[PDB]
Design a protein around this ligand. Structure first.
Ligand code: HEM
Ligand code: HEM
Ligand code: HEM
Ligand SMILES: [As]
Ligand SMILES: [Mg+2]
Ligand SMILES: [Mg+2]
Ligand SMILES: [Mg+2]
Ligand SMILES: [Mg+2]
Ligand SMILES: [Mg+2]
Ligand SMILES: [Mg+2]
Ligand SMILES: [Mg+2]
Ligand SMILES: [Mg+2]
Ligand SMILES: [Mg+2]
Lengths: 156, 156, 156, 156, 156, 156, 156
């Protein structure tokens, strides 16, 4: 089914966002696991997996719409050097991701690609939940203090 | 069954403290969830549900006694701005609530409405349990420090 | 995550409508139960629980958007005094609730708060279900007569 | 297998009658559901699924005999404005359908297409069961009065 | 609940398309079964059923909005003559159906019927899935050859 | 029960047709098994069994009507050289059987042997299902090519 | 544990080959699914996941050896335009990978990183397995013809 050319370019840019997210989160997860902070390791693993499945849905929809998914161009991964940095790196990436998603939905509505709008909304619902998770972890670092925070995240 | 007009007014006043407590404890619980203090939030939600169950039995009786239950005149919620303050706000609401129950129960006794008294004594017993919980948390903030106390209420 | 001010104002308004509905529907339920019309009491109870869950999710959404939920302001409860009027009251409240949900959806769309839009769309479909129930009961009173209608809501 | 061209004509006629029924009964079922007469909706809904199954078997048989099933020429639906009129419309349709069934069996017998005859006899048997139902609902409306009849069909 | 009269008109037009597809997919399913292409027959059978489900919802919504569902009017079936022709007819039909769905959605948004919108969107997502299936069968016919393609759909 | 002399003679004739088919189908089945076309072997085996069950019920009826079942005079088997001719041989035999079944039924009706007619109708229904099967296989050889057809019938 | 810095440069090279592999195989999978070659898509999906597991174990050995994993530099993805090109692209990549694996292993042996060698020997076995699969599919396309080969990979 021939899709709108700019819809597809939007979808490929979200995909590019999801592809940065997949790898940033995966490496952060394995750093935390590596330092002995398993609870964070595991939680960040699942965030990564989540973006993979978003990427999958985006690849699938591009192909249906007779476009060409772009998995070659990998943007800038924001890699913190401590827990507090890592969390804010992921939050910076999610805030870039959310306005880009918002850009695309406006366009889908213009051209009446409502199915693609809905796909993007469900993705946007999920990135807003990751923002909440992330912000809240920064808050808890202030309320309980970094050392307690890390302590609460050694084990599962 | 025609009731005592003043009992009904005591019952509506107790009902009135219940409705404040429902909205306050509920709002406090979501606040605590929102901040990542999910254990504090789950406890406070069950407190709110409890107050809902008292209101339901109060309403039921008022109607049996051919009064008119008052769900319209909501009073002032005591919303704290941090955890210590939120606990103390629940406490104050409860000290007020218990003084009004003791007064209701005196008048029930005087007019021989012994079933209404038994209801209020049950509720009173539940409010004193609540007070014990709140006083023990404040106690615990002091023994272990606010930071450790908040850490032990992040997860379940 | 900071959200649009007129959005949060819109949510606190929808929330205010829910709180009216919680109290009004709960009291009508206990009223129908008190009169021996257990089937109406059961159904009306479950409407009140529905409004409660909607209010929980608004409250959760307002806090994430860094707003301050308003459980303190409680509008005019519309209590009927017989079955026909309590139903007509519920309906009038629901029609006001859906005019406000539409306007608040319009606004979330303009400002690209698509997740808050989707939440409200969900609540709105719930309210339209409640409107269909309310309207059908009033038609059924006309079809089978009030006495048969009440007979059919005696037993659970 | 090449069948009698005229037998095929009858089968296609019978089919058309069943296509009217499907749509008539479905809409009637859904009108009744919409008025909160859930029991009449449910029964009428099964009458509709019933005619769909007859239609399936007529389409299969037409094809086997190398006919062309005609699902294009939808005849006149008989929609009522109230329960009693809806039932009387169902009764009118069914009585036309059995006159045609008997015509078609007469021709099947004549050309020795005994299988087709048997197919139409089994349909005829269902159609007579449906006549019996409709005549009995109309007779019960008289015996218990419309308001009781409809009360009895409010809930499943 | 009073619906916008031109929403109801669109709903009835979508209903009208659904009624064509029901009859057209069912007849195609029974042709394919009759030719021994039973995997094609079953899959086509379930596309028919799914359209019957969309019709049901559309009739249900129209009656709620005080509309009158049109099941008397049946547009032009596109009956193919062989497997390629039948699939292409189903695709042509689906392309008309998605166009009218977008048009109806634009209008629902305009008059703020966001629930009708959401329903129409769910259907559109289903219609688009049927389009992918059809385009995909047509493409496979080209990759594997018609003889093999049909071979692969003889047995269930 | 002394049955009609000519009814009994028709039943012996239909039995003779069954006896041919039994042997013809059993030999075709074992030829297809012997050539490694096991799915055709199995299917033809079950057609053989079915004609055996028909021959049983005819023998039981003939004996009840005080006749002599003729199992001795075996008509001409139509044995084919390749899959295509075997299916066509089966079909030719099935078309002679249905002709004799129709003439026997006509006679049963004139002399009012209605139970014999009902027996013969059930067999006719089975034979038409076999005619359907056989014609459909000859059509699929045309559609997928002989080599694919046979390929799809090597393994059970 | 301070590990050899050139080993760590190998591992990051092996890792960067896995990262090409993941994306390449995951796009081929989804192209195959989008063409209806669902058995090819599923098989290539699992090759993708397999490489993702390889990528995970290398990141972990690197972090433990005190190096910094590189997920930022995405190699050249070899994306075919038909099934046969797709498989040769996979094979092209896998021979580049095995070359790099053997280099890296010889170096591990020099410095006595026997444990990183054993991890590399395990990955090398996986890739040789995948080379066999890919060669065998190319050789099967010659033996059975492309139309049969794709036909056999339509369904799962
Ligand atoms: C750094 C690169 C990647 C790493 C390290 C990685 C790692 C993993 C791991 C460990 C799993 C779990 C496999 C299992 O044991 O079940 C997984 C699953 C998965 N991956 Fe990846 N992956 C990467 C890239 C990608 C990409 C680029 C995509 C899509 C474009 C993707 C899509 C998926 C999907 C759909 C799953 C299945 C998730 C589920 O349903 O559980 N991955 N990945
Ligand atoms: C801001 C106001 C309120 C909020 C947010 C609220 C919310 C809730 C929620 C989320 C539940 C759990 C329902 C479920 O998931 O099954 C609940 C249950 C319940 N509510 Fe409320 N509610 C409110 C006011 C009230 C009032 C005023 C009453 C009674 C007069 C009431 C009576 C009840 C009862 C009896 C239950 C069931 C408890 C049980 O037996 O498990 N609620 N409410
Ligand atoms: C007004 C148009 C129609 C409507 C609204 C409609 C609706 C429905 C619904 C809701 C179902 C049940 C689906 C499920 O939940 O599984 C159904 C089943 C079915 N329909 Fe229809 N349908 C229509 C036309 C037709 C026609 C024209 C035919 C055949 C020529 C047909 C054949 C069938 C069959 C065979 C079934 C399955 C019955 C069973 O459960 O065994 N339908 N229909
Ligand atoms: As083949
Ligand atoms: Mg496609
Ligand atoms: Mg009373
Ligand atoms: Mg104490
Ligand atoms: Mg927050
Ligand atoms: Mg045929
Ligand atoms: Mg209505
Ligand atoms: Mg005897
Ligand atoms: Mg270390
Ligand atoms: Mg080899």
């Amino acid at each position: 089914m021939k899709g709108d050319k700019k819809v597809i370019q939007h979808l490929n840019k979200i995909l590019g966002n999801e592809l940065i997210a997949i790898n940033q989160y995966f490496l952060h997860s394995r750093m935390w696991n590596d330092w002995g902070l398993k609870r964070l390791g595991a939680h960040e693993y699942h965030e990564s997996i989540d973006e993979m499945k978003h990427a999958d849905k985006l690849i699938e929809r591009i192909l249906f719409l007779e476009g060409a998914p772009n998995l070659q161009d990998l943007g800038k991964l924001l890699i913190g050097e401590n827990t507090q940095e890592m969390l804010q790196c992921d939050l910076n990436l999610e805030l870039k991701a959310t306005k880009d998603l918002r850009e695309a939905i406006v366009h889908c509505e213009q051209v009446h690609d409502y199915v693609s709008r809905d796909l993007l909304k469900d993705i946007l619902e999920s990135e807003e939940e990751h923002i909440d998770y992330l912000e809240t972890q920064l808050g808890l670092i202030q309320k309980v203090g970094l050392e307690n925070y890390l302590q609460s995240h050694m084990h599962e």
